[PDB]
Amino acid sequence: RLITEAKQKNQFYCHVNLLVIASRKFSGDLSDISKHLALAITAMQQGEGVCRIVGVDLAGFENKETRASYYEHDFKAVHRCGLAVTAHAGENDDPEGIWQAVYSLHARRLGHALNLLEAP
Amino acid sequence: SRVLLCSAGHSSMVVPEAFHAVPEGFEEVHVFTTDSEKFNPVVLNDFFHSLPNVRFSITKCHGLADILNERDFEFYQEMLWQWYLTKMPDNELPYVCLSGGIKSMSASLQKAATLFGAQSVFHVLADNNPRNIEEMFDALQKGQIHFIEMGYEPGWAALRRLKKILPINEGCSRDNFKPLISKSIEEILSNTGKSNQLPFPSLAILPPIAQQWLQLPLSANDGAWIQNLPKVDLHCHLGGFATSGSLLDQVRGAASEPDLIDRTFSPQEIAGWPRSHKSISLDKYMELGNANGSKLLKDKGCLIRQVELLYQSLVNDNVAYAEIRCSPNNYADKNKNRSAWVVLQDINDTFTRLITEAKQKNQFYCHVNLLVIASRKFSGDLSDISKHLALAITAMQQGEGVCRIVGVDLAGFENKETRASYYEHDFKAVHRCGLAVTAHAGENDDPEGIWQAVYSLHARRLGHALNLLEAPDLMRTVIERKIGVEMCPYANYQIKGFAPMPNFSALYPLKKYLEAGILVSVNTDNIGISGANLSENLLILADLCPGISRMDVLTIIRNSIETAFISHDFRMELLKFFDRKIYDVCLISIKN
Amino acid sequence: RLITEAKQKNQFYCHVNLLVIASRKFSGDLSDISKHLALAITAMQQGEGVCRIVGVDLAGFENKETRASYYEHDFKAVHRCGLAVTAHAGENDDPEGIWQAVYSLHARRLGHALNLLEAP
Ligand SMILES: Nc1ncnc2c1ncn2[C@@H]1O[C@H](COP(=O)(O)OP(=O)(O)OP(=O)(O)O)[C@@H](O)[C@H]1O
Ligand SMILES: Nc1ncnc2c1ncn2[C@@H]1O[C@H](COP(=O)(O)OP(=O)(O)OP(=O)(O)O)[C@@H](O)[C@H]1O
Ligand SMILES: [Mg+2]
């Protein structure tokens, strides 16, 4: 509604798309990841609307146990339905985690990871 | 009412004390007797003339005396039974006395009173056995006549439609002797599983005659009881409800856009439907439903009309709980913003509104839930399966509602290209969330696929599974885990063929399935295409599985309740309501 | 023998079936679990007898070191032959352990599990 209102005035407007986060709550309510993924998958399919859902997020509590090879069982269909995946890693994790996140989750983008220089 | 029934013998003056038995006065006295010359009705007529408000009826068994012969005994028994049936109050039990008559008629009348109800049966005893009226009057003045009763006799709450089906029959003889209940009495004990398969614990309170009636085998003429029977349908397809006829016409008439309706094509007619005399294939079975389906259900108004008509049919068939299989993607259309989620939401809100409006008026309402069909290789890419699962879990996540989403479904064409061991990894999340799976592991599917469905998909139900009898280990684990097996009698009979199908040798395995202990449930699949609702689906079992019993049908209903995906508290309430209704229906069933 | 002796005199008798307990060691001779499973399968294959073998107990130290994500491929064998499995995950365990003990070991019956209240 805001985008259409701004566009009708012919004034400069800011197109905005939404990303559904998947909080890494770890032990608590393990079904939350599946619920969020399915919510995003079915929400991107509304179709009509200048604003839409274009991908999901993997931010949350980063840990060795919470690596990309821990939730990888649930992502077999996010790419199947045409979604996109970002990630948040490298702030405190291991370059192996970043490597698997790049190659297992097929993350098109990546968050932070300021220590890339140490891994040519 | 306050109607007496008595037998007149040599002691013909026993009626006046029977009239005086009540402590507040009496209304109508009726007496039955034989054709012997010993009885003198003049004395009783003169005695009762002092109370003209009392209806005196005297009937004599024509051509009978002394009841000295077995043929005479049965003649007297049948006339007495007919007279009792034609001489009872419509909706109250009468008062009956039997002190007059020899042991034969007395015992017959007592058994008849037990057999048709009586407000109070008693006996009159006199120390000196008075003959003249003044003598027994003086006797009652002191109190010589004592009163002996064994208690109130409820009889059976409903047996009197014998007098409707059997007319007065004033002109009759020994030739048209009706042994209607005697064979039921003969088969009471003449005929372990059938002994303690008793569901619905209140059936124990039910009187024994109707219990043994339930123990009798099923018959075609029990359609009235079957229709009055509260049932459960778990395998029901929304897309095959209306396919032809007035239902299809009125479903078409409510569409939002008439110009998008093909009002010309109609399905090909099959002679003898639903009792198909020739075997049919799955392709023709589905082609019979071509007039309806996703090609016609896109219109929102048409969808609402179809859902309302299906719910009305469910309520009409006395179904007290149902689960509907639906395909939201098939009815979606991005042209009019009709996403699959929107279609499913429309169905859910329509069902919830219908149920609430039916419950507000305190009528019989069919609580219904939805099943999300996830077909295999039906529309192209297999990502549609993931889309269906995601939609189903998101829909169940609504939280609050009345008509909810119990779980998902897995349906395919035959085999191989639609095997049940392809999508475990996709199913992990949806099955973890808390839904349920009913894999269609059956209909010429090898036992290995059924094993994968049971043990890797954790499927709680199996569609059809007709050929389960050839896998003893798979059977054993199915019964050991109480996995529901939905079976559609008419549909499988039409598309596969079972005895008494012409030129067929195989027979339906439902009886052996029930004897083994499988939690079998009887369903309808596609009402419109098969042309048979739940009532005739259950009725056809008499000629499909010979020797099937009524208690077996009740256990089928119990199993259908057992295998449904519902919460514990809702299951308890449903069980209580079903048990009370079942008791009422079997109380008023032996009436006919 | 005891059951037949009690039954032949037409007196109240107690039918008894045995469960082979797959003892938890996790320290040495780890083949003992497979040996126990084979012994239980062969024992149930006797067939005749009022008293028989109907199940296998997964008892022992139910701590995280011996959860249900270890030998499920081995329990495929016992599940194949139509033999019941009883688990034991009731003392000092997480809801995750109970969950995949139910859904991977296919435990048809569960032991203890006193803390189900906190896992709706
Ligand atoms: N994808 C877009 N994102 C943001 N603005 C857009 C987009 N597409 C079109 N517009 C708008 O189209 C309008 C065209 O304006 P125009 O070419 O006449 O230049 P202007 O009016 O002189 O200055 P301004 O670009 O600031 O409006 C712009 O104002 C711009 O905001
Ligand atoms: N599966 C069983 N388990 C235990 N006992 C059984 C079983 N099957 C039969 N029985 C025995 O059958 C016997 C039948 O006994 P009956 O019906 O005559 O009653 P009772 O002798 O008066 O009292 P009781 O039941 O204590 O023996 C019972 O004693 C019962 O112990
Ligand atoms: Mg079906």
PDB file of C-alpha atoms in Angstrom, chain B residues 8-10 33-39 61 63-70 72-73 76 102-105:
ATOM      1  CA  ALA B   8     -60.398 -66.131  30.387  1.00  0.00           C
ATOM      2  CA  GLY B   9     -60.669 -69.799  31.321  1.00  0.00           C
ATOM      3  CA  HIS B  10     -62.914 -71.817  33.616  1.00  0.00           C
ATOM      4  CA  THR B  33     -60.101 -66.405  25.450  1.00  0.00           C
ATOM      5  CA  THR B  34     -60.680 -69.512  23.344  1.00  0.00           C
ATOM      6  CA  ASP B  35     -63.887 -70.797  21.712  1.00  0.00           C
ATOM      7  CA  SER B  36     -64.836 -73.193  24.524  1.00  0.00           C
ATOM      8  CA  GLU B  37     -68.409 -73.099  25.814  1.00  0.00           C
ATOM      9  CA  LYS B  38     -67.287 -73.003  29.463  1.00  0.00           C
ATOM     10  CA  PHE B  39     -66.765 -69.231  29.477  1.00  0.00           C
ATOM     11  CA  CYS B  61     -59.923 -67.777  19.615  1.00  0.00           C
ATOM     12  CA  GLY B  63     -61.880 -72.911  16.245  1.00  0.00           C
ATOM     13  CA  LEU B  64     -59.849 -73.666  19.372  1.00  0.00           C
ATOM     14  CA  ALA B  65     -60.530 -75.386  22.684  1.00  0.00           C
ATOM     15  CA  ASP B  66     -58.533 -77.028  25.490  1.00  0.00           C
ATOM     16  CA  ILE B  67     -55.273 -76.261  23.585  1.00  0.00           C
ATOM     17  CA  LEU B  68     -54.562 -80.002  23.672  1.00  0.00           C
ATOM     18  CA  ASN B  69     -52.405 -80.252  20.524  1.00  0.00           C
ATOM     19  CA  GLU B  70     -49.036 -78.875  19.454  1.00  0.00           C
ATOM     20  CA  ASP B  72     -53.409 -76.078  18.541  1.00  0.00           C
ATOM     21  CA  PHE B  73     -50.696 -74.704  20.834  1.00  0.00           C
ATOM     22  CA  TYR B  76     -53.178 -70.208  20.055  1.00  0.00           C
ATOM     23  CA  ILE B 102     -53.900 -73.297  32.497  1.00  0.00           C
ATOM     24  CA  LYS B 103     -50.098 -73.390  32.417  1.00  0.00           C
ATOM     25  CA  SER B 104     -49.870 -73.273  28.611  1.00  0.00           C
ATOM     26  CA  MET B 105     -51.684 -69.986  27.983  1.00  0.00           C
TER      27      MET B 105
END
